[PDB]
Design a protein around this ligand. Structure first.
Ligand code: FES
Ligand code: FES
Ligand code: FES
Ligand SMILES: [Fe+3]
Ligand SMILES: [Fe+3]
Ligand SMILES: [Fe+3]
Lengths: 161, 383, 383, 161, 383, 161
């Protein structure tokens, strides 16, 4: 379904996304997406019931850049550490068009939040549903959907999930 | 003296709110008694959430779980999610469709109106050759159904109340606030777009304050002709006012507005109705102790919305909710204010912008809506 | 009026339990004072858990940590897990083998009976050439040992009590409850099969009720000639009654039963003895505040069991415990009942099945055991 | 010890199990086992002390189907979401008999529970100890042992761990 | 009687501390009022943490968040982290550099000394063409600044106090303890090595006790000429005394000691100054309810330290902190002692080692520092 | 960057470290390091601010042995279970000297603590930053750095992170 080089790059993509959005370099979050890539962060209750509302729907890499700028310069928020624990990813399909190949893959995740002097808590838990394509810069996300179980949000989601 | 002893409000009027109004659990329990469980209509949902007969949605009033179910006749019943036998909270799902309510500990069955329809072994069990058990024959189902609530449905929204001698919904809101209520809920059929939920570790009143605070948006939300009106008792209020991807605004005016561009309506004590540009939502306050509350956003649209307008509402919902460019600030500052209050509960706030008078203004540079809220609070709570 | 203010029980008798009996923490502290720390034998374990000298198992009585250790002479001592110097809870392991107890903060050494044997520098320290420090010559070791408990071992089970003037165990249970106790603990030596543990967020009494509830199993547990007996004060009770993989039942009757098929025996307030089909266990209640308790299942078999019987018990344990086909319902309904109680603590339950009498019955269609339980409760706590 | 194809299938097995038992298709849990496969969920204290009692011992695929049916149709339980975060699996051994090869592998896991409007909590944490075999349908479990640290169970375990 | 009811201290003196001294929340709030918020200097940090103007560090006193900032003139201000408008805890970072403090809820601006410099729309907003809103013109900025605290800096350490009528820092410490204070903080400029943090679930007093406990270290820490002195009021104290990789010791004496090799100085109620071999740190107590406290280790060196001495201090820090060979035991026993106290809050400890005398000794074999601590405690708390 | 066998051994190294330091054989912790290997456990605030202080700094395999002995025989501590959930590792670089090849890799971790009858909690969360070398016994750690987010430590760190 995928050869070793692609599987290596895929696990690296999941890990890179997780660890970069936990680091001080989280503003590089849009670099994981192609220019037409989308990012949706949606509660399980809306997703399972066919309700289209998300917690966050960035319908372009440009809108993702918008979100990064808003978070970095226009939103007053409690600073916090976050730590992505991404479980073992699974490869579901590889499909082909005239654009090239698309890889569909999933991975469960747990985002752990630590406020400055507080306990580490399960901030947001759910799973990724990704369509991944290959660009000259490596594997990138064409679409990322985060269906999260943690519907009762601990007050606010600021940094990328 | 940082912690209070037999506290008394600092004088008369309401231009200085004491910190212990937010930090005392006895005061909070009295608030549950007098604002949520008596003399008030509290929001329980939207009609579109339960379109067909048997459709039920579990929700809350204060800290009491209730069920809003559509009756086979077409009306809406609201019952308390507590059983009559041994008080089990029997309804566990958030929503679904049932012909009747039932508790499985001993399988007591109730109609969708709360009437006790069945009690296993009620007349006993004859075995060989005796009848064993049974209920005392003075006990009849008429007196052990689910606690029923009175229901007010209007414009697609559904309120309920434990107090059955509460003023009618229209008189509860008053004419001016009811005008804006009907302005959003104008009789069209609504379509649920979805839910967002957040747990905010602050006193529930701080949310009302935050939506009775008109001039903080121009100072707190760095992602940015007004008038403020109140009902007779100063409890409800209405605030009226006139990037890489252009879709993140793409604001199109709508005729039904029909001239104010934004109206934030606080219906005390349970709900906020938000009309902001093209996003329309209800915000349900569900308190949990004196220092925390859950906040449920129901974003909805109208049936006459084509798919472009649905996408418009959905994309502009990115400004609000627990992750919005504008709305996350609110939960953050509410939590930080609660931390401050708990830090020195004998101190006081100063809500003196625009003077000390309480009344409808034609500008947004005033804290008069909070001053009226706490006038009403002092009157209702005897503080 | 949803929250109580100096509440009084709804009349005399015990056919209606008020909700606040489950929601008041002062009532819970009084419960600990009068039912767990006085006038009662409480379960502390099985002899097989400490077969050899020095073998100890840490456990709890109410909310007080204790250690049950087998003495070098062959007896069983039970001491409080609190040190005499500065009250440190020194024993951290669940089980093990110790020549003596010792606290490492200042290394105070106690015999396996709880007697203070050693205090470093007790008589002082000779340095140059003066003696420095030491305990006051009023200080005597005899007066600073571990709080010793009364110990009762019978049939292989071990109870204990802080109260030293408590009635003997046999008279504590009464003849009938002691008969069923001995029916399970018939003198054979027991084999520990294992432990299961679950934290249930409900009032501890709700567990007793659940095993003093004879007709809930036939209505709640969707996985499917009886009599109910009590002791003199109505505190203890005994309930007596007569698929893809076939191994999940394979029920074989055992001679020691020998007439009844199942007996659930509640020993107030601390333990349940379960004999169901081929599974044999103790169920230990360990309360934590008014609204939660831990529940420890000790599943065991007998020494004369071959490996066929060991599996009978092991596979049939799939029906019980925190994940069993039958037992998970119990914790779930207990949690939901507690939520209901906290929702409106002024209300009351209705336990009227089988009438209002308190007494031994020959059928399962009554709530009389709960009525007796709360008769005893009102008597002991004066409400 | 294993080639890339088998390693890919093995990581996919761990991930498939985790994500499928978190989804609405959790009733397909028995399909990860051969017909004689076993599933045991045992506390660490019982396992380490040689006590044979488990929290749940399903000694055949038939008994696993029984369990699925019991959960689905005969047990009243509070509904909740669960989310398996499976750590990086490790391969310990590959052995050979006349049926074919057996792979022994382990992986730590954390099951995160979210009741309907509640916080996300660590419901049950432990590790898997598995014997994995190859069938015409792919890799399957011959035996799965779940030794869990979270002995004080948050009231009840209903869905598959 | 396991739980106290109108408790009274067990007799006179302070050789037996009742368990409820650690388990009562009213006592804890009185402790905050009388030991942390009045008549005491409490530790807020080191000057090296804020070398340049605008440099700030957020910290706590009792349970009240404060900010320690270096003033543009070179002094050190300490202000309360609570806003004057509606009490919002506005400073969210731990440290940084600010021209001024400001709260973003309504953007109130304060000087680095706490003086309210700016209030948006204080004077109103003229729109078209009326002036609207504004603060009442009797409202003065002078009366709504941040609560300012008095600051005492010496030797590089910085204490603060809400009480402005507090005795000077030198008289607060007394001559004997100020000698050892200055012995560590001898005027050299310090370089911060780093921070360690631990949440210990025990009463905060247990930490003070632990560093007023001279004979536990040779018995608890199995990884191992003295005198112990106190101030006039028995509150502050000083305890003075004279492997595979060898780097884990490499103890080298340094001239500034000079003669005592180790000094543990407790400054009541907030801080410990530790000089152990070549590791020097402050340990800040930050209480959170009666049953927990945060503990912040600031490990530091001196500016004249080369690269050898810096690494020496760093490697020797492996014995201390929340993971140290010596220090982890302390948090463990403090937590376990708190558990013991909560188990039976009517009981009492026995601190009778060295007799009942309170005074400076020439040996380690005494509990006199704890007896003096609780003499002072009874006096300040009226028990 | 790395071939399949090295990638397999790498994931096995992360998983082996995690599961061994959760087991009764945690005393074998020093065996994951070469004789000159280092182990540093440092708060995020110290690391990001350039403050050199660690929570624990073992500057050789000998000092790691010291720590193991101290924990096993010289420290009174509450016993507890710990459970490492190591997210998907990422390989950053492979460098070369005459000493051999060094692989630089990272992986986020969450250590879950279970005290004897308590809830499972996030004890310590952060990430590993490792330099990995190949020895005749397999891949070993030359240096392991644990930058942890959970700065407010739940009272004490005893077993290896
Ligand atoms: S409690 Fe509702 S049926 Fe018995
Ligand atoms: S407290 Fe037990 S030895 Fe000091
Ligand atoms: S609270 Fe600081 S400005 Fe309103
Ligand atoms: Fe706002
Ligand atoms: Fe049952
Ligand atoms: Fe010590």
């Amino acid at each position: 379904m995928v050869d070793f080089k692609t599987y290596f790059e895929l696990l690296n993509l999941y890990s890179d996304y997780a660890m970069v959005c936990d680091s001080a370099n989280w503003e590089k979050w849009p670099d994981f997406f192609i220019e037409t890539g989308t990012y949706r962060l949606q509660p399980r209750e809306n997703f399972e019931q066919g309700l289209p509302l998300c917690l966050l729907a960035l319908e372009s890499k440009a809108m993702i850049r918008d979100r990064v700028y808003g978070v970095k310069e226009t939103m007053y928020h409690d600073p916090y550490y976050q730590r992505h624990i991404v479980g073992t990813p699974r490869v579901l399909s590889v499909e082909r068009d005239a654009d090239g190949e698309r890889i569909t893959a999933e991975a469960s995740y747990a985002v752990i939040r630590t406020k400055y002097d507080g306990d580490s808590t399960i901030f947001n838990a759910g799973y990724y549903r990704d369509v991944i394509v290959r660009t000259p810069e490596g594997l990138k996300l064409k679409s990322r959907l985060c269906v999260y179980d943690s519907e009762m949000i601990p007050n606010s989601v600021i940094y990328p999930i | 003296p940082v912690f209070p002893q037999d506290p008394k409000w600092p004088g008369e009027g309401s231009s200085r709110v004491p910190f212990w109004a937010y930090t005392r659990e006895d005061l909070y329990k009295r608030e549950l008694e007098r604002l949520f469980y008596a003399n008030h209509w509290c929001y329980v949902g939207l009609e579109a959430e339960i379109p067909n007969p048997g459709d039920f949605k579990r929700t809350v009033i204060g800290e009491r779980s209730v069920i809003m179910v559509r009756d086979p006749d077409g009306g809406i019943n609201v019952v308390e999610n507590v059983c009559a036998h041994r008080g089990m909270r029997f309804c566990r799902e958030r929503h679904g469709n049932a012909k009747d309510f039932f508790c499985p500990y001993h399988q007591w069955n109730y109609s969708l109106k709360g009437d006790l329809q069945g009690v296993p072994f009620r007349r006993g069990v004859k075995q060989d050759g005796k009848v064993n058990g049974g209920m005392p024959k003075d006990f009849k189902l008429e007196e052990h159904g689910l606690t029923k609530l009175k229901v007010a449905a209007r414009g697609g929204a559904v309120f309920a109340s434990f107090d059955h001698d509460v003023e009618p919904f229209e008189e509860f809101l008053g004419p001016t606030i009811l005008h804006y209520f009907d302005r959003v809920f104008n009789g069209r059929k609504l379509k649920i777009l979805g839910y967002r939920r957040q747990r905010i570790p602050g006193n529930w009143k701080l949310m009302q304050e935050n939506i009775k605070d008109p001039y903080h948006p121009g100072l707190l939300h760095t992602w940015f002709k007004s008038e403020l009106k109140m009902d007779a008792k100063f409890r409800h209020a209405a605030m009226i006012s006139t990037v890489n991807d252009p879709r993140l605004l793409d604001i199109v005016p709508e005729p039904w507005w029909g001239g104010p561009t934004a109206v934030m309506t606080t219906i005390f004590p349970s709900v906020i109705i938000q009309q902001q540009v093209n996003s329309v939502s209800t915000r349900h306050i569900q308190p949990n102790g004196h220092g925390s509350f859950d906040f449920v956003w129901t974003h909805f649209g109208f049936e006459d919305d084509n798919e472009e307008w649905t996408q418009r509402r959905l994309i502009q919902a990115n400004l609000f909710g627990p992750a919005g460019f504008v709305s996350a600030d609110d939960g953050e500052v509410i939590e930080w204010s609660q931390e401050g209050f708990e830090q020195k509960p004998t101190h006081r706030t100063v809500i003196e912008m625009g003077g000390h008078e309480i009344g409808d203004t034609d500008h947004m540079v005033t804290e008069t809506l909070i001053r009226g809220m706490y006038d009403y609070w002092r009157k209702v709570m005897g503080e």
